[PDB]
Structures are given as C-alpha cells and as structure tokens.
PDB file of C-alpha atoms in Angstrom:
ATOM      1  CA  UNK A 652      -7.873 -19.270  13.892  1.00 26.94           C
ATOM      2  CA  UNK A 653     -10.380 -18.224  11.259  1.00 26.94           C
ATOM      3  CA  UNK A 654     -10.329 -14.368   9.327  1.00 28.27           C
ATOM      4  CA  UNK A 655     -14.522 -14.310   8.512  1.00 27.31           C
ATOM      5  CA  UNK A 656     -16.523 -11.178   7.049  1.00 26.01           C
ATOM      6  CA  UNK A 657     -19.597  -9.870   5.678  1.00 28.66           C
ATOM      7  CA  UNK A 658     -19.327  -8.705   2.497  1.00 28.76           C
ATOM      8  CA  UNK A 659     -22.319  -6.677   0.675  1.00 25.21           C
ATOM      9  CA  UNK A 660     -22.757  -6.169  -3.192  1.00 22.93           C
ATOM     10  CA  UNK A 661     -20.443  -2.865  -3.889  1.00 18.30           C
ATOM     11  CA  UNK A 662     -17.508  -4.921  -1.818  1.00 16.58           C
ATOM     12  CA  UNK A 663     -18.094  -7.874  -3.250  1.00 16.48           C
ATOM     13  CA  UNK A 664     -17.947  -6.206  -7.107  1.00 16.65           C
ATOM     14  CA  UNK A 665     -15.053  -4.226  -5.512  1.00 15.80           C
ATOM     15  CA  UNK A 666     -12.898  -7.254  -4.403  1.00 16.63           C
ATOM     16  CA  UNK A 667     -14.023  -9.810  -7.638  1.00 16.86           C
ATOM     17  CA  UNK A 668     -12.454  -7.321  -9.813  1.00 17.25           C
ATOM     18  CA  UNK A 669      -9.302  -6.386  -7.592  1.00 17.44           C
ATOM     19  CA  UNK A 670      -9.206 -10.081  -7.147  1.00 15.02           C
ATOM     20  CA  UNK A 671      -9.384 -10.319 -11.181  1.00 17.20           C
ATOM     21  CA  UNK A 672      -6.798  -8.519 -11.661  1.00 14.84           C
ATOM     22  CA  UNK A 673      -4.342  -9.149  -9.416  1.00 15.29           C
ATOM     23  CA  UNK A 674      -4.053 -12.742 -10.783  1.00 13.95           C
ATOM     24  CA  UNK A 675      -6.007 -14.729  -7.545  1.00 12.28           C
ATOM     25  CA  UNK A 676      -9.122 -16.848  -8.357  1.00 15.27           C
ATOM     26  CA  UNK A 677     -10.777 -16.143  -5.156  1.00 12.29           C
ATOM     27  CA  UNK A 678     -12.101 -13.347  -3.157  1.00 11.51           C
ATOM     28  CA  UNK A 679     -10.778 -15.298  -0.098  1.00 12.27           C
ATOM     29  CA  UNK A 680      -7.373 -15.438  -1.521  1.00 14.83           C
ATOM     30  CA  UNK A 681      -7.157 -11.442  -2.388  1.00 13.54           C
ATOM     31  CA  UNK A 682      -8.157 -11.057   1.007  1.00 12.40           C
ATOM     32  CA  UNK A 683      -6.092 -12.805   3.399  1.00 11.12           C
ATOM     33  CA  UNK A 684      -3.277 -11.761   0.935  1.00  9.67           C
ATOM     34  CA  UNK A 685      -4.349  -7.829   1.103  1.00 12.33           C
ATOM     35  CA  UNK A 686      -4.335  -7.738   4.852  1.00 13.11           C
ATOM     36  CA  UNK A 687      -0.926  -9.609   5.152  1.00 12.81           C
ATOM     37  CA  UNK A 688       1.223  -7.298   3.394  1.00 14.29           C
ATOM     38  CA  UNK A 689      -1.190  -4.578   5.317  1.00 14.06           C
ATOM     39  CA  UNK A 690      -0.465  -5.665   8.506  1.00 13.58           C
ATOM     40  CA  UNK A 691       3.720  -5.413   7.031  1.00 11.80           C
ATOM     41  CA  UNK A 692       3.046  -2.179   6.125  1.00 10.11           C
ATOM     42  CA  UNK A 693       1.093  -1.082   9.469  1.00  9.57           C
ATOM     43  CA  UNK A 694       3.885  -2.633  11.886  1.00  5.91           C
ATOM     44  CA  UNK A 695       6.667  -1.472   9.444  1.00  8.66           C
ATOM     45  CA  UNK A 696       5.623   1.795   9.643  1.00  9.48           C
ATOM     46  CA  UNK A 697       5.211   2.463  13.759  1.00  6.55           C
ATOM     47  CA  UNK A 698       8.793   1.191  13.658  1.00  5.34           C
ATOM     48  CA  UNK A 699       9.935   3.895  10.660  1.00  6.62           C
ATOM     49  CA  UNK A 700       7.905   6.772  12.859  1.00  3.94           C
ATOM     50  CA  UNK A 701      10.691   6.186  15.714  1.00  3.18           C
ATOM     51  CA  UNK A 702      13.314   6.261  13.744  1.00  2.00           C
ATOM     52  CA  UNK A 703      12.315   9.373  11.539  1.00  2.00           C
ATOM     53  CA  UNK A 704      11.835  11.337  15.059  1.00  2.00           C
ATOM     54  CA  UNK A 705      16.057  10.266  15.823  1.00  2.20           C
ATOM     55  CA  UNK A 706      17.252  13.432  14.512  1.00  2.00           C
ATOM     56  CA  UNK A 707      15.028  15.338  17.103  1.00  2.00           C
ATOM     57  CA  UNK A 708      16.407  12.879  20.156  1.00  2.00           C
ATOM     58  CA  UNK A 709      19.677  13.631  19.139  1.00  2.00           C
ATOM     59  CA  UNK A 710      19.571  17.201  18.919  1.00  2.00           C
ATOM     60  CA  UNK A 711      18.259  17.352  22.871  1.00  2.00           C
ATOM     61  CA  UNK A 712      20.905  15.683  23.943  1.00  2.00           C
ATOM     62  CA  UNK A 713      23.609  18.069  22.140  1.00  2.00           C
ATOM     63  CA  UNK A 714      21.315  21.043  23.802  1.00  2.00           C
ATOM     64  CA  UNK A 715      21.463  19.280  27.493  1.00  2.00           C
ATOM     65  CA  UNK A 716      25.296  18.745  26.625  1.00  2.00           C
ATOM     66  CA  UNK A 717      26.952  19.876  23.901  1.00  2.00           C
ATOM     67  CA  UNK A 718      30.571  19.599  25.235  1.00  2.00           C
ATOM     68  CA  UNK A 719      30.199  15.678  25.761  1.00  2.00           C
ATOM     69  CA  UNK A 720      28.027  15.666  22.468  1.00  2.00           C
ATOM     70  CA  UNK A 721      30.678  17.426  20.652  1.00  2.00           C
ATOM     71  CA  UNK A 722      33.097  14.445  22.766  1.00  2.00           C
ATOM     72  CA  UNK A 723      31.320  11.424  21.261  1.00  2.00           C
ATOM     73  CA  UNK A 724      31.021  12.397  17.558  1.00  2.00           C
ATOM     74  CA  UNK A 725      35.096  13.024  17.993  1.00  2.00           C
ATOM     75  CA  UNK A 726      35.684   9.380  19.497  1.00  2.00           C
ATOM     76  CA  UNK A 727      33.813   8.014  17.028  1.00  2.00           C
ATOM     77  CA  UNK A 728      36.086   9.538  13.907  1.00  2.00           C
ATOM     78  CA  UNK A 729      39.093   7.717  15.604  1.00  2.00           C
TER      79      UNK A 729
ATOM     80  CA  UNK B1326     -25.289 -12.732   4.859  1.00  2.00           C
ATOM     81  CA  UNK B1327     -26.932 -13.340   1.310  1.00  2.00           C
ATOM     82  CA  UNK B1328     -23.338 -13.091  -0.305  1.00  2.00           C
ATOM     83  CA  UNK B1329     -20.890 -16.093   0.682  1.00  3.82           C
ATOM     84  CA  UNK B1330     -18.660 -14.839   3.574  1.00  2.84           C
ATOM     85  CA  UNK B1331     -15.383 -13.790   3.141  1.00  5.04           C
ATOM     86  CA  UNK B1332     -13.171 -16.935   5.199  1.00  6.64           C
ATOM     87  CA  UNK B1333      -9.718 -18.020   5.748  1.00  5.90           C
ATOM     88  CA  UNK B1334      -7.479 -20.078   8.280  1.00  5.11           C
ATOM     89  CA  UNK B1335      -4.550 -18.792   9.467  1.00  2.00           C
ATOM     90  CA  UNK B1336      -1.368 -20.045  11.315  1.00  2.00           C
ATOM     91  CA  UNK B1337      -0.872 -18.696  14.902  1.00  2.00           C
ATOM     92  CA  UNK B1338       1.899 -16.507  13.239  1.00  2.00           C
ATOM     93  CA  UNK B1339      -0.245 -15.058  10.667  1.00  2.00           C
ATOM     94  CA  UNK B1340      -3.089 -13.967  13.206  1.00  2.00           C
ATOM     95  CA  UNK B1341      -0.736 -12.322  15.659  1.00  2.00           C
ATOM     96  CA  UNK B1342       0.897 -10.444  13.372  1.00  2.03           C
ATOM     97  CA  UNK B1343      -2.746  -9.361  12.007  1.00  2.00           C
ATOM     98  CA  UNK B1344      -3.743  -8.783  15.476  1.00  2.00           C
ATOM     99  CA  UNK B1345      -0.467  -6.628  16.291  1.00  2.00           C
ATOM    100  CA  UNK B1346      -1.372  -4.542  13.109  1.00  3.57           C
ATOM    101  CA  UNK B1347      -5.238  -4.281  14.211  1.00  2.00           C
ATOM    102  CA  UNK B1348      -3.915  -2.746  17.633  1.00  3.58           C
ATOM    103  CA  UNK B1349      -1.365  -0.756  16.002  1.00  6.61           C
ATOM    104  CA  UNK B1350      -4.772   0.781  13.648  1.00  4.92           C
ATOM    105  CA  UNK B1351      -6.890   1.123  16.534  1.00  8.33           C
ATOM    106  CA  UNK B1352      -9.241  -1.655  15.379  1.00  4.21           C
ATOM    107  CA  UNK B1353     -10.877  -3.747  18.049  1.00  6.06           C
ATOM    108  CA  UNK B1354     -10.589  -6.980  15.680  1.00  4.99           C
ATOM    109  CA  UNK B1355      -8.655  -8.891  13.185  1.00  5.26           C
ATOM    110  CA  UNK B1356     -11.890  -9.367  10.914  1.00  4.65           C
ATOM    111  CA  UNK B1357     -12.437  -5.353  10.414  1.00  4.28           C
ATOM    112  CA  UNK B1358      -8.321  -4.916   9.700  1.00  4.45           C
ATOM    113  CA  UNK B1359      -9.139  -7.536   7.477  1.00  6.39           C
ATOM    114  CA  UNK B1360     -11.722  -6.448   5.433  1.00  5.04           C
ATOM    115  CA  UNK B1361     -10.796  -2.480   5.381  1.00  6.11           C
ATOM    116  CA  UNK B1362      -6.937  -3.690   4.452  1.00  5.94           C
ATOM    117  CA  UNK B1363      -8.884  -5.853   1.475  1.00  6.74           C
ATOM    118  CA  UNK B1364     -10.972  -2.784   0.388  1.00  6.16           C
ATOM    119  CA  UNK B1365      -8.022  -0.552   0.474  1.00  8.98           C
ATOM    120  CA  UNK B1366      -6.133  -2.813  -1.295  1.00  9.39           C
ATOM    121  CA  UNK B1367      -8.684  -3.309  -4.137  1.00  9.09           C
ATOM    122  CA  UNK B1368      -9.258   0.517  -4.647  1.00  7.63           C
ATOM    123  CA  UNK B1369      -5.522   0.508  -5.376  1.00  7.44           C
ATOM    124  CA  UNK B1370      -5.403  -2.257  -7.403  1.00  9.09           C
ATOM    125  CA  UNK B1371      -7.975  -1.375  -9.241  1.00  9.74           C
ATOM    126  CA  UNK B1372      -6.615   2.615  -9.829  1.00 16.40           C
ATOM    127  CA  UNK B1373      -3.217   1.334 -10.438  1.00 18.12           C
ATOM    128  CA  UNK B1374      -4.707  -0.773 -13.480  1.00 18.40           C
ATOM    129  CA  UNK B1375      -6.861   2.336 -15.096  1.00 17.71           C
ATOM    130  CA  UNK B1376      -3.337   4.528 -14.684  1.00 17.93           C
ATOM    131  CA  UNK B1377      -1.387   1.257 -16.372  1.00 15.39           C
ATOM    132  CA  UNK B1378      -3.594   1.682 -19.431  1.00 15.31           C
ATOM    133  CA  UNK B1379      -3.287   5.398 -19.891  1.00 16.49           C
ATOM    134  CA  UNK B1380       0.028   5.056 -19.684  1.00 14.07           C
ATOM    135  CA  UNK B1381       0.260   2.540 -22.443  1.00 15.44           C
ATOM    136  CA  UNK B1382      -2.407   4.512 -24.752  1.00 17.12           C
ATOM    137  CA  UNK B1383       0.251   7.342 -24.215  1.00 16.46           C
ATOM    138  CA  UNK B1384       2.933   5.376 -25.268  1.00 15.50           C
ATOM    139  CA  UNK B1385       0.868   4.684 -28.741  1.00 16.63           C
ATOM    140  CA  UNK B1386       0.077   7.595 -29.425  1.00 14.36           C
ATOM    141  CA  UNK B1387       3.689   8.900 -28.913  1.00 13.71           C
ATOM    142  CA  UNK B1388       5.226   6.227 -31.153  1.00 13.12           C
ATOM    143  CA  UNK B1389       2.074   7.391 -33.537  1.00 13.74           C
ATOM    144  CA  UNK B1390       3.887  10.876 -33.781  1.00 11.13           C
ATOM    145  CA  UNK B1391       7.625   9.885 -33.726  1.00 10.11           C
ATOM    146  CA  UNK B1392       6.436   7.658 -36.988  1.00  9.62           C
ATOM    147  CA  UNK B1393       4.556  10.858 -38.653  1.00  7.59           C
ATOM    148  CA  UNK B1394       7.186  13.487 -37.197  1.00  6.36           C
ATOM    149  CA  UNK B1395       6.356  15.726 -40.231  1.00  7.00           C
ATOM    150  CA  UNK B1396       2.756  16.036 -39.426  1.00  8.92           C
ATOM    151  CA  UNK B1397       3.911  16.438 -35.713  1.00 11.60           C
ATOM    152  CA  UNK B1398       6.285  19.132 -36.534  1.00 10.65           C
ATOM    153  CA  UNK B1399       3.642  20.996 -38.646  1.00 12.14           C
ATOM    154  CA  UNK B1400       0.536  20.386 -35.290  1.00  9.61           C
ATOM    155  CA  UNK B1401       3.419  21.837 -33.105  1.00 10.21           C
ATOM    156  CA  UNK B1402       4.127  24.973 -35.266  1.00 13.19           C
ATOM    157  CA  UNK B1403       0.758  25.922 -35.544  1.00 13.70           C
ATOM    158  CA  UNK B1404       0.255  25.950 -31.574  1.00 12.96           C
ATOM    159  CA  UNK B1405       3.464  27.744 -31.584  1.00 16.39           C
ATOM    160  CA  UNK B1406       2.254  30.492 -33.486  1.00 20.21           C
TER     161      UNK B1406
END
C-alpha cells in the first residue's frame, strides 16, 4: 500500500527542480502525481492501439465477404 | 539510501491501476513504473519550461521590431540584397 524508491543525487536534482516547477512542494508529491497520469497514459494507450488497428479488421472481413460486407454498410444507411 | 526515500500511500484503486500500467510496460513492480514515470516526467517538465522561455524571449524581441519597423525594414533589405 506504499510506492517507496531510491533516489541518488542526479534524480534527486532532477525531480527537486521538476518538482519546483510544476508548483508541488515535495519530491513525494511530483512523484506519485507523475506516475498517475503515467499509468493514464500507459493503459489509455493499449486501448487506442486496438482501436487504431479497426480499419485493418474491417477490411478482412470485406475480403472473406464482400457481398455481405457490401450488405451491412447498406442496412445501416436505412 | 543516504538521500531520503522517495514514499507515498496509496488507495487500493490507485495501486492497481499503477500495477495494471507496470504490466502493461513490462515492469516487474509498481516502485520502478514509479520512479522511471517520475524521471520521465521531470525531463519533460523541465524541457517544456526552457522551450516556454524561448518562446517568450521571441515574443520580445518581435514586439522589439514591430516598435522599430523602420530599422527592421532597413536589417531586412540589406539581407535581401
């Protein structure tokens, strides 16, 4: 239930100034903060890589069946 | 360990979603997403600052020459020809 870590003296100069900065008054604070919006951005993405490839999934099925492809897209303008 | 530790609780909600993002990154634990996200972070931070005051001593100098357009005008004509 506890985020810990080891920080040396180029992180430490590295996150005090980031942590300047960006308005926070700790290093702790930058921190947990940083690897929220991270983890956001991580899961966020994974979910934007499936959906990019949708073009792709879409055009297989037209090649496996084009005629019931070609079907669908018309139902769908009615 | 000379340094004081980086340290923070979390909620249960908090830590899964930081341990769904560490397996998502390949990293075997929440305290290395953590500290590589916070390095990351402070890189960009820290470059977006340095590119935020270029941009404003742009800006100066730009308002410098639209109040000396003359001078401008004559700087410009000279590299033009």
């Amino acid at each position: 239930p506890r985020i810990t870590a080891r920080v040396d003296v180029d992180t430490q100069d590295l996150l005090a100034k980031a942590a300047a900065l960006a308005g926070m008054s700790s290093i702790n604070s930058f921190v947990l903060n940083a690897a929220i919006e991270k983890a956001k951005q991580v899961i966020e993405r994974e979910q934007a890589l499936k959906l990019s490839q949708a073009d792709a999934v879409l055009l297989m099925e037209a090649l496996d069946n084009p005629a019931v492809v070609n079907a669908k897209l018309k139902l769908a303008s009615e």
